[PDB]
């Protein structure tokens, strides 16, 4: 990672204005709306055929809101991401069995949900940040 | 692969889109050059500069092939073959770029339309740049 | 994409391939199960056995569908169209694990045609095997 | 990595067969054969144009000679890969700028280039053992 501070005051400042609510489910929504082979993974959350019940559905805005709990505890722990998301690999890569390309994508799709949220907020440096942020946060989960 | 609906999202995307194709294209590359920076090893000989004149130039030639993969949206392969000619043979990208410059495309999508980036329109677009990166890479 | 001399590689391979279709198939499954054990998460029902009984049906099955899909290797989306629906739709395989068993299928065929893998029949092979994991997933 | 020590008597049993000037060469040439736009990166290498002027030049030949040079320094050390493969870290993503996924297409060639010398010798636990030494060569060089 090794965010710059002033790329840790980008990281701090916009993250501080982040609504958890609708940017988590907004993101797993967005999982499941553009990558649908995800979707093989949440089986027991009802409807996730037609993207407004993916949208709609109170389980994935419930879980989005515990993987932005997730980031969250990853942006008070950037040093120590490996020591922080060691259960949370642990149950993605042993139970689960999610291959950690999927950790990339939803990343990705995090970053495309800040910028629909901030417009001329999200410059290309704080977005630089977050890239570093998403691809610690996936490389951490990858073990 | 492109249904109809999506596109109805793509075209109503870049029409959404319309003058602003070279501010994108070039925030678009902005983002790319700042956020993965190997890519510009791709780009030896140009300024990379944070709002240089051949990097919002080239922008808008990136845009103006991406309107014309818009209008040919069905004839990707044969309105796409001097750059799918372009970047296997003379620049040999590696594909995983055209991945990198899809999704900032898709970022500064996000930053520009708040209001018709659905995610009906974002799967769409994402189809859709995978589908022009598919075309890029298919003198492979 | 695949040029005829590709299908000209593709075509003499599983050619020099014939009758050990369901033997190469079922070696290549206990490859991809034995290497890379998450996609033993997709055959939740199936005894996977170094050397079972599914494994080695459903490796002959994966064989014949790929050489109906060499049969029609300018005709794989309408020849793997009831394949497409079922690994896209009702599995949902994620795209990647296409790539993993098209690897062993390459390490199957460099295990068993050691004279006729050369790097262009390896190249048309991998190809092949891109283009048919680009069909069955073509329904995203 | 990790490897079982009946995997580490299959790795080791197998990799003291292989010859070094055939394998090396071979794999790095079907690499610039397989994946056309690794051939960006050898741009001094003279004709990499045909795919028997790849798999007849030199310079791939005593180049893949050193590939499988440090192969063999990653096998000799299977434990320290991070400690081992920093200077070539170093070298392949800060002078060289390649993206990581191609170490990952050189282990997956280097994988059927064993194949390809060595038939039944090479079963699928083998096989599992040499892709657990070549992810994690490859998570070693993604540095
Ligand atoms: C890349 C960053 C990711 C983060 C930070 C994250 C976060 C989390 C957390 C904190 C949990 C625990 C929920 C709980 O304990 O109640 C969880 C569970 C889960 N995650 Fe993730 N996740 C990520 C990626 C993914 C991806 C990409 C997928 C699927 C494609 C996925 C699928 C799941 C599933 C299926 C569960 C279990 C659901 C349940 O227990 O009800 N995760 N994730
Ligand atoms: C994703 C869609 C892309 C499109 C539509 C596109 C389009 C173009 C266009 C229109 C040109 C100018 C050539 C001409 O006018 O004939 C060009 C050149 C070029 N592109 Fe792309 N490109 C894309 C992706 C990429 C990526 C991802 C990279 C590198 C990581 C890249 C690197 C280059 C380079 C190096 C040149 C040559 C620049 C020069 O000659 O000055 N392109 N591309
Ligand atoms: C080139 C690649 C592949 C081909 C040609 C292929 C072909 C087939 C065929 C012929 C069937 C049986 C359809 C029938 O019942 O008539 C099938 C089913 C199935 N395939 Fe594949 N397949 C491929 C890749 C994969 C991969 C990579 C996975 C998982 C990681 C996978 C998982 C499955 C599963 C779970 C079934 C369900 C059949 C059962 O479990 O009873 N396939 N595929
Ligand atoms: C597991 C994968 C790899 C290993 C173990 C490896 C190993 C090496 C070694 C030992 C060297 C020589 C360093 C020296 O002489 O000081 C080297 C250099 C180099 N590698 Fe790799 N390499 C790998 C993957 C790749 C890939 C996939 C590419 C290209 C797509 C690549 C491109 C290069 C280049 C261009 C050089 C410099 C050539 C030169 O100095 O003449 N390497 N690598």
Redesign the interface.
């Known amino acids: 990672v090794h965010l710059t501070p002033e790329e840790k005051s980008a990281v701090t400042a916009l993250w501080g204005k982040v609504n958890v609510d609708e940017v988590g489910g907004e993101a797993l929504?967005?999982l499941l709306?553009?990558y649908?082979?995800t979707?093989?993974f949440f089986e027991s959350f009802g409807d996730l055929s037609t993207?407004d019940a993916?949208?709609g559905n109170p389980k994935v805005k419930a879980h989005g809101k515990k993987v932005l709990g997730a980031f969250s505890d990853g942006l008070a722990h950037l040093d120590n991401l490996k020591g922080t998301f060691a259960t949370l690999s642990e149950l993605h890569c042993d139970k689960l069995?999610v291959?950690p390309?999927?950790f990339r994508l939803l990343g990705?799709v995090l970053?495309?949900?800040l910028?629909?949220?901030?417009?001329?907020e999200?410059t290309?440096?704080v977005?630089?940040a977050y890239?570093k942020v998403v691809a610690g946060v996936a490389n951490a989960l990858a073990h | 692969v492109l249904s109809p609906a999506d596109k109805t999202n793509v075209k109503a995307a870049w029409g959404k889109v319309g003058a602003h194709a070279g501010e994108y294209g070039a925030?678009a590359l902005?983002?790319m050059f700042?956020?993965?920076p190997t890519t510009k090893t791709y780009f030896p000989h140009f300024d990379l500069s944070?709002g240089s004149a051949q990097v919002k130039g080239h922008g808008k030639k990136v845009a103006d092939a991406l309107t014309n993969a818009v209008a040919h949206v069905d004839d990707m392969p044969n309105a796409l073959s001097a750059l799918s000619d372009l970047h296997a043979h003379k620049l040999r990208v590696d594909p995983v770029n055209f991945k990198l410059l899809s999704?900032c495309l898709?970022?500064?999508l996000?930053?520009?339309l708040?209001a018709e980036?659905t995610?009906?329109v974002?799967?769409s677009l994402?189809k859709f740049l995978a589908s022009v990166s598919t075309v890029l890479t298919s003198k492979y």
């Open positions: 929504g967005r709306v553009v649908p082979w979707q093989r993207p993916v949208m069995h291959d390309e999927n990705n970053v495309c949900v910028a629909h949220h901030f417009g001329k999200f290309p440096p977005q630089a890239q | 925030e902005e983002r700042l956020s993965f944070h999704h898709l970022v500064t996000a930053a520009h708040p980036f995610p009906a974002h799967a994402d």
